[PDB]
Design a protein around this ligand. Sequence first.
Ligand code: 7B1
Ligand code: ZN
Length: 258
Amino acid sequence: HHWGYGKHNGPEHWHKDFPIAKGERQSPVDIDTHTAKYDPSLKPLSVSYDQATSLRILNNGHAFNVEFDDSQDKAVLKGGPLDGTYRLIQFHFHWGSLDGQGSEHTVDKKKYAAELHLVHWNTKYGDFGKAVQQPDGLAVLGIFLKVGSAKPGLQKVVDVLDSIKTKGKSADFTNFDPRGLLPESLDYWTYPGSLTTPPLLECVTWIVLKEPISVSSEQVLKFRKLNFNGEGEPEELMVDNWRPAQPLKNRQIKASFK
Ligand SMILES: NS(=O)(=O)c1ccc2oc(NC(=O)c3ccccc3)nc2c1
Ligand SMILES: [Zn+2]
């Protein structure tokens, strides 16, 4: 399986190995702000990251993941559209070659410079691998990044990137507090969708925050020094690792706010 984000192996090719690429609940999507409806039945969103235990940061050849210890209920997402408890397992980003593109979701067709995904699995299924086989198995909290002032809570991540430049490299990454990546408001849009990379499984409740975070140009420029390739291989900068918006089909995007 040699999928990626080049001309020869990018998102337009993925359907050949992963037919669900052309499925009925694929992600990301465009969020039309004038079509999404406020839903008063949405319960309040509860982001409880006080006991989060980060462990490691990994360049997987597609992005970099900050991995958490999820062997107990240490950092959980609840409320909003969700039933039950969803446990934080990792976060990562998608970003562009230029500030004008990079996000996977769009807002009225606007692309942001990047998009953070905090990935959580539904604890009624016991483990992540079982959760991804269920329509309600994962909740991904998506947060847009725009370029402006620096995000201080991001800098520990930025400064470790030098040590994981190439595919397969990892570093110790303990005591990182993901609350420093959140915007002030938790206002959100929600819809049923998928993983945005292969295997493209249709197992995700998407919760996309309306308020972006600001990061500095220097911060995002460091993301773009990463490599898709392994050590000693020809250098391919890790940029433009985003899937474009997919058909909405028979779905409704709900707003948590008036
Ligand atoms: N862009 S996305 O839709 O948020 C997205 C896309 C693809 C993903 O594959 C994984 N797997 C694990 O984290 C994992 C965790 C435990 C064991 C194996 C894998 N999370 C993903 C999130
Ligand atoms: Zn993602």
